[PDB]
Symmetry: C4
Subunit: 219 residues, 4 copies
C-alpha cells in the first residue's frame, strides 16, 4: 500500500487539490474579518475551517510516510508541519495568539507552489552574506542602547528608561522616523549636546546600511 | 480615398499638429485652475475644449481606418482611444471624476512623442521581472493585514478596524511614515508586545524591497 | 604688457592667493553670523569684505584680458563672473536677497580648485542622462497637480487650493514626509476614496525614482 | 623572559581568554542597566568591573613589550589602548561622560576578533573614495547654513537663529524628516518664497547623496 499512497501524494491532482484549498481558506479567513459576515455565515466557516485543518494533517501525515526522515530535513516541509501544528492547538487555553497565528498557514501557498519558492529561496540566500554586518550592527545597537539608557533614561524614561526602550528608540532613529522633532530636539532642551550622540549614530547606521545594500549588488 | 488619408494621417504635419494641440490644451487646463481666469475667459476655454475633443475623435476615427485591427493591438493607440473616450462622456451625470479624468489626455504628449514612449517603455518593461516579488508581498500584506485586523481593530478601529484599514495602515508602516510615534507607540500603551508584530514586519518588507531594487540593478 | 599680466594671472601664486582669500572671506562670513562679533568687529569685516570684492573684480578683469572670448565660454569662469557681479550690486536698492546671495561666492572654492571641479563635473555630467525621466515626471506632476487642485482644493485649500500649492503638496508626498497622517488620512475624513489618488501616485513616483537611480548605476 | 611573555601573549589561549572577558563584561554592562539588579548585586559588579579593567591594562602593557613601536602603528592596538585608557580615568571628576564612555570597550569584541576586523576594514576602506563628495557637501551645508541663519533666524531662531542651529536644521531637512509640516510650511507663513531655498537644497543634497551611493556601487 506504500507505493499506492506514494502515487496519490506525488500526484499532480493531490498537490493542486492542496493549492486549491489554501486559496479557499485564504479567502475564507479575510471574510472572517467582517463582523457582518460572521453574524450571517459564522458557523459555516468555522466547520469549513476545522475541515481543512484535518485534511492538512491527513496530508502532512501521508506526506510523511512517503518521505520519512527526508521530510524532517526539508525546510518547506518542516514549515508546513509547524504551521499546521499551530492550527491544531485547541481553540482555547494559553495565549490567544494561537487563534491568530493560524493565519500563518496561508504562507503554504508559498511552500506548495514553485516560483514563490524560487523567489523566497532567492531572497533568503542573500542573508548569510549579510550576517557579518548584521552582527556588527547588533553589537553597535547594543552598545549605544546602553549609553543612551544611562544618559537620557532618568529624564526621559519613556524613550530610554530601560535597555529595551532605548533599543526601540534607537531603532526608530535608524529608520529616521520623526527622529529630530520627536526626540533629539526634546532631548536637547535638557541635554544641549545630545546631538553629539545622535548625528554620529545616524551617520554610522546609515553608512553601514548603504554598504549592506551595495553588498547585495555585487553578490 | 484610402491612400489619400493614409498620406494625410501618416504625415509629419499631422502628428506635429496633434502634438501642437496637446501642449496647447495642456496650458489651457492649467489656466482652468484659476478661479480668476475662469470668471474672465471661461467661455473661451470651454469651447476650445470641445473643439480639441472633436479634433481628437476625428483623428482617432481617421487613425483607425488607416490601421484597422493593427490599431486595437497597439498599446499607445488603445490608450488614446480610451483616454479620448473618457473625455467624450458628457459634462454631466454619473460621477464628476469623469470631468476630472479628462486631464488624462495630456498623457497623449507621452503617447504621441517618441523618446517619451521610449522612456515609458523602458520603465514598463522592468515590471514583469518584479511580479514574483510583487506577488509575494501582496500575499504578505494580506496575511498581516488580516492578523492586524484581529489583533488591534477593537481598541484601534481607525487603523486596523477593517481589513482595508489594516491594508492602508500597513502600507503606511512600509513607507515608514510616522510608524513609531504615530502607531506603534500608541498601540503599545495597550498591547505592550505589539512591537513584536511591527519590527519584524518592517525588516521583512524593507529587506524584500531592497532586493527588488537590487534585481532591477542587474536586469 | 599683455604677456606680463598673462604671466601674473596664469601664475601659481595668483591662483593660490585667490584660494587663500576665498577661505578667508569664507571664515569671515560665518563670523558675520554672530550678533556679538558684529558689535565688536563689524566695521573690520565690512571693510575686509568691500576689499575682497575689489580684489575679485580686478582678478575677474585681468582674467578676461588674458582669455577674452575663451573666458565667456568657460562654465567655471562665467560662474565666477556672475557670482562676483551679484556681490557688486550696492548694499541697497531692490530686493535684500542680493546682500544674502553674496555668500554664493564661497562656491568659488569649488570653481578655483581642481578636485572639486572634477567631482562637480562628475556629478553634473550625470544629469543629461536623466532628462528623459525628469521630463516624464514633471509632466506627471503637472497632470496630478491639476487633478488634485480640482478634486481637493475646495475643502483643502491650504494643501491643494492653487495649482502651485498642489505642486508642493505633491512634492511632499513624493518625499513621503508625513503623507498619510498629515494629508491623506485628513482628506479621507471627507473624500473616503482619496486613497485611490495617492497610493498610485506614490507607487509611480517611487518606481520611477528607483529606475532613475538604477539608470545612473549603469552609465 | 621576553620570548616567554611573547609566547604567552601570542598564545591562542590568551586571545580567547580576552575574548571571553569581553563577552562577560559586555553582559555585565547590560545588567548594570537594571536599577533592580544594582540594588541586589551592584557590589559584585563594580568589583568584577574594576578587575577586568586591571587585567586589560596588564594585557595592554604586555602587548607593548611584545610589539613596541609596531603596536602604536597598529590602528586596532591604538584603539584598544585609547579605550582602556578612557576606562582608566577614576570614577570621578571632570565630566561624568567618561564613566559612560567606558562602555566603548565592548568595541574590543570587534578588534579582538577577525571577520569583524575584516568587515570593519571593508567598511572603512570605502571612506576615502567618498571624501571628495563629503568635502563638497560640507562646503554646501556651510554656505546654506549661513544663508539660512541670515534669512530666517530672526523670526525663527529655534531652527535658524545661529550658525549651529541652521546646520542642525539643514541636516534634518536632508534626512527629509518632517521638513514640510515641521519647517517649511511654517516658514512660509512669513516668508512665502522660502520654498525656493528649500526645494533646491533638497534636490541637490538628495542627488549628491544618490551619486555617493552609486559611487560605492562601482568601487
Ligand atoms: Ca518621515
Ligand atoms: Ca514627523
Ligand atoms: Ca506632529
Amino acid at each position: 500500500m506504500y507505493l499506492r499512497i506514494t502515487n496519490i501524494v506525488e500526484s499532480s491532482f493531490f498537490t493542486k487539490f492542496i493549492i486549491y484549498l489554501i486559496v479557499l481558506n485564504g479567502i475564507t479567513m479575510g471574510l472572517e474579518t467582517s463582523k457582518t459576515f460572521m453574524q450571517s455565515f459564522g458557523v459555516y466557516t468555522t466547520l469549513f475551517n476545522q475541515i481543512v485543518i484535518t485534511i492538512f494533517t491527513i496530508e502532512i501525515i501521508l506526506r510523511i510516510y512517503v518521505h520519512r526522515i527526508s521530510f524532517f530535513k526539508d525546510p518547506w516541509s518542516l514549515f508546513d508541519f509547524f504551521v499546521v501544528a499551530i492550527s491544531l492547538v485547541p481553540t482555547s487555553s494559553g495565549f490567544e495568539i494561537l487563534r491568530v497565528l493560524r493565519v500563518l498557514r496561508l504562507f503554504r501557498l508559498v511552500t506548495a507552489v514553485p516560483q514563490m519558492r524560487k523567489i523566497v529561496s532567492a531572497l533568503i540566500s542573500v542573508i548569510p552574506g549579510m550576517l557579518s554586518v548584521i552582527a556588527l550592527m547588533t553589537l553597535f545597537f547594543y552598545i549605544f542602547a546602553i549609553m543612551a539608557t544611562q544618559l537620557f533614561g532618568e529624564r526621559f524614561p519613556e524613550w530610554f528608561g530601560t535597555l529595551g526602550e532605548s533599543f526601540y528608540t534607537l531603532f526608530q532613529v535608524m529608520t529616521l522616523e520623526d527622529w529630530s522633532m520627536g526626540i533629539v530636539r526634546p532631548l536637547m532642551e535638557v541635554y544641549p549636546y545630545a546631538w553629539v550622540f545622535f548625528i554620529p549614530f545616524i551617520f554610522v547606521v546609515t553608512f553601514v546600511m548603504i554598504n549592506l545594500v551595495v553588498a547585495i549588488c555585487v553578490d
